[PDB]
Design a protein around this ligand. Sequence first.
Ligand code: HEC
Ligand SMILES: Nc1cc(Cc2ccccc2)c2[nH]nnc2n1
Ligand SMILES: [Ca+2]
Ligand SMILES: [Cl-]
Ligand SMILES: [Cl-]
Lengths: 465, 103
Amino acid sequence: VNCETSCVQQPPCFPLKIPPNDPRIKNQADCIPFFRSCPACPGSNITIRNQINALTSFVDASMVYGSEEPLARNLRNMSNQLGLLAVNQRFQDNGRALLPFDNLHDDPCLLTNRSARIPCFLAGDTRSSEMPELTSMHTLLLREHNRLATELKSLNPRWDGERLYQEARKIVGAMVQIITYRDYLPLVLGPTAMRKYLPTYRSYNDSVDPRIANVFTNAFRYGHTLIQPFMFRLDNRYQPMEPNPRVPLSRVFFASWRVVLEGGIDPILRGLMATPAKLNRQNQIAVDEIRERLFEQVMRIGLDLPALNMQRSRDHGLPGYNAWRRFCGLPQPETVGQLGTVLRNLKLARKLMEQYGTPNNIDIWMGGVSEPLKRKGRVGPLLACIIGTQFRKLRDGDRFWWENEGVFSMQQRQALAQISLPRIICDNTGITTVSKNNIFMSNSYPRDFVNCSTLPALNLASWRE
Amino acid sequence: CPEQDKYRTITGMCNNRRSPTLGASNRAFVRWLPAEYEDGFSLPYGWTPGVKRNGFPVALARAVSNEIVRFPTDQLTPDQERSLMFMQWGQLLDHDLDFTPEP
Ligand code: HEC
Ligand SMILES: Nc1cc(Cc2ccccc2)c2[nH]nnc2n1
Ligand SMILES: [Ca+2]
Ligand SMILES: [Cl-]
Ligand SMILES: [Cl-]
């Protein structure tokens, strides 16, 4: 009945049962909690169970603006005609904006520190306070909209609140799309999967279904294998910022206080820029900070992210590994040896077989994160297919895609082509030394870092009326 | 649907003029493959003990995690080719595309 406390498997509960010799939970009468995702059609004996997307599938920066009209309205600064996003009124980060707080019933951020009394931040997406690094990116973007709605006001002083906001929102939305498709995706997929799945943009196609597919919500969780066991903070010299420069992850979840009180977003961004991501390896898939101690502080038990991903795929009725390989036009291994060949690793193949019995039953996330990485990419062929296919749909099927005719003028697009994540950091933080492009490859200081002086800024001259 | 718009709706409604809910918030996901449920329509594999999938028993997600995923923190390999910003962009990006609500 109550999923956060009981081990009873009764709708909507689907608790993750505990196996023999568990390295953390000795009582097999216990469970890792799990609420099944809301059905699209509640209680139907007819239609096949599907889940809902609370968000716009488009790369439209809805994480900044909201996907529901009342939220979007509330995230805005309605005190004037400046078309700004609401900023925290109680706090600042070296005279710079922080996200405003949210008024939650049971607030998990307050639970991370009684003394501090720092609640969850309000943003377009509700998971903004999940970790201070994600919170830094949400804050980075809340500042870019306000900075653009200030440059546009000084350029077009006859413009009102709605115009400035809509025009700034549009630029942020395009920055998100550029970084993703020009910088992010090629490094996820690799060059070959990039040509195959994302050939050069032609134009908007109204027959391309832009919806997020159920499988993608699981396949895109490949990133859980890139997670580092600590949150790293570095000063202006890119040297550890003591005390607590490497704070374990299981102590940072919902720790919005660490942003407000422990130094703001700058020590966090420098950390993201100058720290290498974890590398996914067959015998080094995902860290115990997420596999054992996920939300440890705020729950009755530590959650297991890899296991939650596998329970979620079963709850979402997702076919197994081989059905997805077939869908991708990839050979489906039937035997242990055949899985060995696909995996380039017979030891992992033997283990997967012991667990699943057949490569037909291997859960999507599990079989996807197990495949050897494509050259210059961070996924194997199956995830590259699912990831690539989904992104082409969000691109080819977006009427408001930055390159679509009528969205931005040829002049506005030549100006937008100049954008970068290192520059957005420069323009909205006290950070003076940023990553050399590509920001996603650059992980070593001072070898991969350069000054803000060298970097071209975005020119809004083509936005003058 | 408004005949002529300059900006997106917050909701994503009207982006596709023929099927205006497409890509819009608070709608069902699209399926690329038919759902595979124990009963065929709603119950997840592993919901019922002894109920097999393709003639093989259903592994516990926690057990697959213990056997396949579990590794000692000390062994961690830092990626010489990627920043933690690469991980972080992935999550922020994911948060622009999908959120599956629960009760
Ligand atoms: C590269 C992408 C990526 C990164 C990085 C990432 N996630 Fe995920 N995560 C996802 C996706 C997709 C989902 C599914 C979200 C949805 O549809 O509701 C998700 C789901 C989850 C869920 C829901 C679990 C469940 O199935 O019930 C948890 C918890 C989670 N992530 C935690 C984290 C945490 C914690 C971090 C960082 C500290 C993080 N994620 C980093 C993509 C990512
Ligand atoms: N479906 C999810 C769930 C969570 C946990 C959470 C839920 C509500 C608010 C904050 C954090 C995620 N954290 N990161 N991606 C996520 N995708
Ligand atoms: Ca969106
Ligand atoms: Cl506030
Ligand atoms: Cl699907």
